[PDB]
Amino acid sequence: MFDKITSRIQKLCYGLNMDFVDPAQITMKVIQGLYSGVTTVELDTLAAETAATLTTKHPDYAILAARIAVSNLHKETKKVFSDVMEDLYNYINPHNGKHSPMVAKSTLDIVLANKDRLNSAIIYDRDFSYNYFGFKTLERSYLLKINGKVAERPQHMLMRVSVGIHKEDIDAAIETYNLLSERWFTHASPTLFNAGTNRPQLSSCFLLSMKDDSIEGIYDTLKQCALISKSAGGIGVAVSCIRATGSYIAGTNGNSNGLVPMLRVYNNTARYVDQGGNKRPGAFAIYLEPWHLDIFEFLDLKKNTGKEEQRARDLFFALWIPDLFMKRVETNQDWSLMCPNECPGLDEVWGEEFEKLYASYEKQGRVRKVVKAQQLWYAIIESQTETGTPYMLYKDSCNRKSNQQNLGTIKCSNLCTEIVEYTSKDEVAVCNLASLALNMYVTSEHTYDFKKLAEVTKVVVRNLNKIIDINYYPVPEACLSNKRHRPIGIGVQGLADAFILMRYPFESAEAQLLNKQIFETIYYGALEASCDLAKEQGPYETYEGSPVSKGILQYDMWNVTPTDLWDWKVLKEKIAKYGIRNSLLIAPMPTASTAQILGNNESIEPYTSNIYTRRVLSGEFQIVNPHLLKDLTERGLWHEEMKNQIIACNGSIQSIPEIPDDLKQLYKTVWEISQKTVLKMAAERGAFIDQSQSLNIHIAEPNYGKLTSMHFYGWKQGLKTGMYYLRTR
Amino acid sequence: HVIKRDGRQERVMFDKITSRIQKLCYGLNMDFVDPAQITMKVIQGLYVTTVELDTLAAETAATLTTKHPDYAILAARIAVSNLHKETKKVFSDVMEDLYNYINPHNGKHSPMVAKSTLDIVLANKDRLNSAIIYDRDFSYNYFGFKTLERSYLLKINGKVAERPQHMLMRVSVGIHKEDIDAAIETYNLLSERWFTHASPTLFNAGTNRPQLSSCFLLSMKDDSIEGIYDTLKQCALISKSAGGIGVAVSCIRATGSYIAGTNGNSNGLVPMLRVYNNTARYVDQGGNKRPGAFAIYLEPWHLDIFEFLDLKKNTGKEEQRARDLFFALWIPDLFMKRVETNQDWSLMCPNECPGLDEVWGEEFEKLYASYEKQGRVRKVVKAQQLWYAIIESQTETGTPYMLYKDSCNRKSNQQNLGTIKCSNLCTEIVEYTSKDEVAVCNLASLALNMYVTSEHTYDFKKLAEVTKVVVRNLNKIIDINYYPVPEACLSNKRHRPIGIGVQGLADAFILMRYPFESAEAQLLNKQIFETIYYGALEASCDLAKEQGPYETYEGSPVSKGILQYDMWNVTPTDLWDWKVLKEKIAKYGIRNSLLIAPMPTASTAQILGNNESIEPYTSNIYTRREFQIVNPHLLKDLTERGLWHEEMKNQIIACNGSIQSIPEIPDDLKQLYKTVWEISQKTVLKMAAERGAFIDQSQSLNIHIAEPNYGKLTSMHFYGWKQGLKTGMYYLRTR
Ligand SMILES: Cc1cn([C@H]2C[C@H](O)[C@@H](COP(=O)(O)OP(=O)(O)OP(=O)(O)O)O2)c(=O)[nH]c1=O
Ligand SMILES: Cc1cn([C@H]2C[C@H](O)[C@@H](COP(=O)(O)OP(=O)(O)OP(=O)(O)O)O2)c(=O)[nH]c1=O
Ligand SMILES: Nc1nc2c(ncn2[C@@H]2O[C@H](COP(=O)(O)OP(=O)(O)O)[C@@H](O)[C@H]2O)c(=O)[nH]1
Ligand SMILES: Nc1nc2c(ncn2[C@@H]2O[C@H](COP(=O)(O)OP(=O)(O)O)[C@@H](O)[C@H]2O)c(=O)[nH]1
Ligand SMILES: [Mg+2]
Ligand SMILES: [Mg+2]
Questions:
Q1: Three-class SS of residue B599?
Q2: Who's near A434: CB < 8 A, 6+ residues apart?
Q3: A42 an active-site residue?
Q4: What is the H or E stretch that residue B531 is in?
Q5: Which residues carry this modification: N6-acetyllysine (chain B)?
Q6: Nearest CA to ligand 4 atom 10
Q7: Fold topology of B1-735
Q8: Do A223 and B233 count as a contact with CB atoms less than 8 A apart?
Q9: Beta bridge partners of B328
Q10: Sign (positive or negative) of CA dihedral B157, B162, B163, B168
Q11: What is the separation, in whole angstroms, between the first and last Cα of chain A?
């Protein structure tokens, strides 16, 4: 009756700790509602759900929940890759009768022609390694559906992504498949969505400089954003060269309306071209430089307060901050706002040069409004304490140390503030992204395995590089920028989890060492790989003239001298001889949902909480941090009463009477870590990061004193991105 | 004790001021020539200067208008000879200065006049200067002149540098270039006031990249964001260049429709207009006043019609409104029939039911009902439910405008091009548009009041004679004009359409002793539009005989020996031959695909002091700039009859501008100055129709209903439609 259920579940606890998992208990909760017309697929789904709500009891419950769902996904699915591929291709849309392939014919053909080999390279076992909430995330958006029914197993998608990247190179494809399915690294969603399909828009981010300062020019740029948006790209726009409000319009005879009305047009564009349908408007980051006359209004665009004609709330906002400005704040001083029309080219030059031009324009009469630099400064942080944005990036720091600095002045960053690339009136910059699951490399022996991490890294460089060519650009200028400079963005995830599996607290000296080494190898490995490609395919079109082409690597620009781990001199001897294929390589991105799939914490970030909520459909589930939960149960200290204590503390282990110290250090949240140490650790690794890194500052005691030193700390440390989002109480 | 305009300081003499006013009552109604009433007020307050005492002088004169409207042409004389006193005599010298302009900004040499256009003038200083009659400056009223000076006379910082005549001549040569014979000829009529070109021409003729046209009508390129944003660019560009637009938006697929290539669903008409609405607000020509004007045209079968009508309500969720825009329905006969016979009406998505907007009439019906048979219909409502929504919208915003797709298309000489998908911002222009043609139009309006005889009759012969110069002018503009988009140019050089309108029509009736709606007025209306047609065709033929026909002429209703009245099945009166005309078009043909189109004359009628366009006087008491004005003819008639006692204005205001009950005013004058609210709107409809048998485009036709409701509104629309008008309604004015 009820056994028929239990031992069906039991058949799937096939390695989980059974002193904490009790399948008899999932049965209890399932029993509620006896065969009142409940199908086996229905019942199976009820079980994994029940099982998942019991994660708070032990993490293995989540493994189980996952197994049950996967088990079903398999009983509802074709066991043969080549077969699914064909069906995906043969899809007829019932609504209009049109044959509408779901994979690319050419991908199918590379597959059919290699049926046996590929088909049998799959281990459908690997599907069972996803944890329940990762699986649900995949199932929701990542596995192609036919008629609302999921057609692909996860291994299928993974194999589609590989033979979509590597086309005829089966060996290469089969390599990538194993790396992907064994969870060593993953490509970014755009690639997981489109590799092997028709519009293979495989790129995650786009930068573009506003064209000219005209109505013709503005609208052209807009048209570009709409198209890029329709390709569900995320953009950054440099807006600083547009006339300010009041400025003269010579042709008509009147007065420029300023940045707000124009920005309000972009806003409603982001709402309109939102993939077609629902929430998450298009998503643009507008980048101002704080010398621009309109800066003060630009800062109130996201405020939750009326005069609707003066808000632009679906946009995102960032400061392209020059050094001069930071000085004039810290050493209390006047700051003079010009109109980029009275005062040309302020944006097209940086640092030593920049400061010359500004001070020139200034003591020359050509200011339009002089204010105390501190009055602006506080206006900034008044919106950040309010809205979390604008993001803080240091224009001069980005230009000072970008291997792309020979192309001209880098005019901004992207949506997520880790990409620092050049844009012109005829190049929109692009980036292809993947991430390393750093947790994967801590040895069965509590050491780290840098050889394998370098080794894997080398593969990722190859793939991302193929993508550049394979990829479909939304606008010709994107295709241009990309073939010209061939930049890529290698990134990480689970860096938190690495430490935890090493027993290293986050802010510990040992963790500060690994953080160095970990990003040291990745960069050593990517270069070695790019350098290899350069031997094979030639160095990129704009190579000679750049920093590395003049013998200077990233850390050189930071004056960082790296650890014994790798022999730079030898790698440098290679790059000297062949060059490198890729203009830039490393750009740790939020891993917003890729990490959510694999099971790790996002990016370079520590644990926000030790309990957190995931909701699935109508289901809502409290997830305790896995590492912690093993440590606690696997030590007898865990019970339910305690769960609620921790939950009574937003998620802090800290006050809990009977929890050991080595564990408290280990599992302290971010609201508990020295943010100064956070920025110091980003700075230290940033030396081996040729792009920026999406860096969030978590203050909880949300006062202006504590924040004003944060930014300046960030700045002086020499960071390109000082702040992504300000997350607070 | 007041410092004169020379530095040298004369005493304030209460006889000096008054006889200096006499000099300018050189043409005035004797019994109300009282400059002793004037200096009494001028010398009441004294706080030095001539120019400073001339302006108070000239304002206090304007304020004695509601005693007699000659005080208002005098009020203008003492502001215009004020202006005269320090604005250069000779014209060549003035056009000279404009070119030499070196502002102080980019302190850069910034020619306020065309390269060539003085090379022409000073190639002639003599002939053009000895053509100007600066006494014509004294023929304006105060408020004409103040709007003339406000923005039509070229300012050289603060000080306006042009005299009225000066700006007129500028235009005359900015149009005709080398042909001085026929540039003086134009200048004559223009300063004599027998017509005017529209503002853009008045503004830019003879300047350096001449924005010479006001109308643009385009249709939304394709149904893709690629094309949606191409159009938006176009509109921004046109907007920048002053241009008013109508856009045909019916081909964009409905809310909910499938996006194949993203596998999502269109957010629909609304989210997209919002981008347009904000564009209108952004590109408002630079800074202030009013958002670029875009009228948006939907056909009522489109799935998003009910939202469309909500866009203008100034009450509703923000991301669901679009108040800065303008809304017009492009209505097919089917829809009206379905309403009147109370049947269902099917809403479809242009992506599922393509090319509905591509065809009209007996053909559209086939395709549409075919779509019904195949059950490709997204929603079906009772046509009357849709109707009701329409006139809620009008009941509370005066829009949408009502044009009739099939009347437009069936009666257009542009037929042979395809289906006209929309009209212009003011609903007078009915022109073809396609993926790479945007229709333009160049306007001038004839001052109808000016063709009445001394002994009270109509001079149809000169009406005709003037009209001809006008078309040769408007046509010479097509070639001389500067277009903001390639497609605009292409369209115009292909089909070469021309928009000739009118003003001062109510005035024409009054001057002829006619109550607006009388049999006499009803005929004269028929007959003055009969002539304006014959006239402009006689010239368009003449032009084709000289320059050849226009590119797409052959195959058009005219090339098949069919003129507008023929397309309306109406017989012209005995007045003109027609038999003889059709014969010379049979051989030579015509240079202009379209000729006539009574646009409103918002600004240019205020200038020449005529009542707007083709309508009645709306009140007998109104307000310019504040300063008051009782209708010119009523006062004249009242005062010269003795009926106008001081008191009696307070009576006519009390009952909101009506003379229908003041027991003093005889039954005949009561007839003659009936205001619009007192005139049968169905008669103003029957008339527009009677008249528009001679207008090859449409005519912007406001409808006035004091206290509206579903009854009256449906009644008048259906009537307007039955009589076969292309524009059924412009604005609904209530109140
Ligand atoms: C036409 C127009 C321009 N602008 C602003 C947007 C741009 O930042 C700025 C440039 O407009 P432009 O279109 O470049 O104006 P222009 O053709 O007269 O060229 P210029 O004055 O440079 O000689 O003016 C408005 O804000 N509203 C408008 O209506
Ligand atoms: C991409 C996109 C399209 N649309 C609407 C606007 C137009 O009505 C229509 C044009 O979409 P298209 O730009 O033509 O998108 P598509 O390339 O996928 O073309 P299709 O679906 O026709 O194969 O869809 C949106 O409303 N929002 C969007 O984000
Ligand atoms: N259009 C759009 N793009 C986004 C959004 N969020 C992130 N991106 C892009 O994704 C990049 C970073 O990858 P990430 O956010 O970690 O996503 P993931 O790796 O695919 O889960 C950014 O640089 C953006 O260009 C969004 O909400 N909308
Ligand atoms: N840009 C713009 N164009 C207009 C506006 N009103 C009218 N127009 C254009 O001018 C035509 C009507 O003429 P009218 O308003 O009387 O012009 P005017 O009397 O010469 O100033 C229309 O067909 C429009 O194309 C406006 O408010 N803005
Ligand atoms: Mg410009
Ligand atoms: Mg399309």
A1: coil
A2: A185, A186, A187, A188, A191, A460, A463, A464, A489, A490, A491
A3: no
A4: helix B519-547
A5: 16, 373
A6: B214
A7: Anaerobic Ribonucleotide-triphosphate Reductase Large Chain (3.20.70)
A8: yes
A9: B297, B401
A10: negative
A11: 51
Active site residue A544: no
The domain ranges of chain B are 1-735
Q: Examine residue A200 and say whether the peptide bond preceding it is cis (omega within 30 degrees of 0).
A: no
Q: What is the DSSP letter of A302?
A: S
ω into B164 cis (within 30 of 0): no
Decide if A369 contacts A409 (C-beta within 8 A).
no
Record: contact B262-A216, CB cut-off 8 A: no
B656 φ/ψ sector (left φ>0, alpha ψ -120 to 50, else beta)? left
**b/e code B675-689 from CB counts within 10 Å (16+ = b):** bbbbbebeebbbbbb
Q: Which of A205, A343, A416, A531 is catalytic?
A: A416
Task: In whole angstroms, give the CA distance from residue B674 to residue B665.
Answer: 12
Closest C-alpha among A278, A291, A285 to residue A263 = A285
Interface A:B, Cβ pairs < 8 A: 97
Contact between B298 and B305 under an 8 Å Cβ cutoff? The reply is yes
The response to whether residue A234 sits with its C-beta less than 6 Å from ligand 3 reads yes
Query: Does any ligand 2 atom lie closer than 6 A to the CB of residue B266?
Result: yes
Rounded CA-CA distance A419/A431 in Å is 8
**How would you label B592-601 residue by residue, b for 16+ Cβ within 10 Å and e otherwise?**
bbbbbbbbbb
Which of A256, A268, A276 lies nearest to residue B274, judging by beta carbons? Answer: A268
What is the spatial distance between Cα B357 and Cα B299, in angstroms, rounded to a whole number?
8
Locate all alpha helices (DSSP H) within B177-312, ordered by sequence: 181-192, 199-204, 225-240, 269-282, 305-308
Does A213 sit in the ligand 1 pocket, CB within 6 Å?
yes
Declared resolution, Å: 3.2
In whole angstroms, give the CA distance from residue B281 to residue A309: 10
The reply to whether ligand 2 has any atom less than 6 angstroms from the CB of A230 is: yes
Task: Take atom 20 of ligand 4 and give the residue whose Cα is closest.
Answer: B198
Please give the number of the atom of ligand 2 that sits closest to the Cα of B260: 21
Nearest one of B616, B554, B619, B565 to B589, comparing CA atoms = B554
Task: Give the method of determination.
Answer: X-ray
The answer to whether B20 and B67 have CB atoms below 8 angstroms apart is no
- Secondary-structure percent of chain A, ordered helix, strand, coil, rounded to 5: 45, 10, 45
- Rg of the Cα atoms in chain B: 27
Distance (angstroms) between ligand 3 centre and the Cα of A275 equals 14
Which DSSP symbol is given to A80? -
The domain A1-729 having CATH identifier 2.40.50.140: the answer here is no
Backbone angles phi, psi at A275, to 5 degrees: 70, -15
Helix, strand, coil tally for chain B in percent (to 5): 45, 10, 40
Distance CA A76, CA A333 (A): 69
- Residue bearing tokens 């880098």: A410
**C-alpha to C-alpha distance for A69 and A63, rounded to whole angstroms:** 10
Binding residue positions of B? 4-5, 10-16, 50, 54, 199, 214, 223-225, 240, 253, 260-261, 424, 428, 601-604
* Identity of the residue in A96, A226, A254 whose CB atom sits nearest the CB atom of B288: A254
Residue B160 in tokens: 């306006």
Tokens of A568: 């730079």
- DSSP assigned state of B109: B
Query: How many other C-beta atoms lie within 10 A of the C-beta of residue B416?
Result: 18
For residues B322 and B276, is the Cβ–Cβ distance under 8 A?
Answer: yes
Of A248, A262, A273, the CB nearest to B225: A273
Nearest to A142 by CA among A189, A195, A202, A196: A189
What is d(CA B636, CA B668) in angstroms, rounded to the nearest whole number? 15
Burial of B274 (0-12, 13-18, 19+ CB in 10 A): buried
Catalytic site includes residue B188: no
Q: What is d(CA B251, CA B350) in angstroms, rounded to the nearest whole number?
A: 6
Helix (H) or strand (E) holding A322: none
Name the DSSP class of B497: -
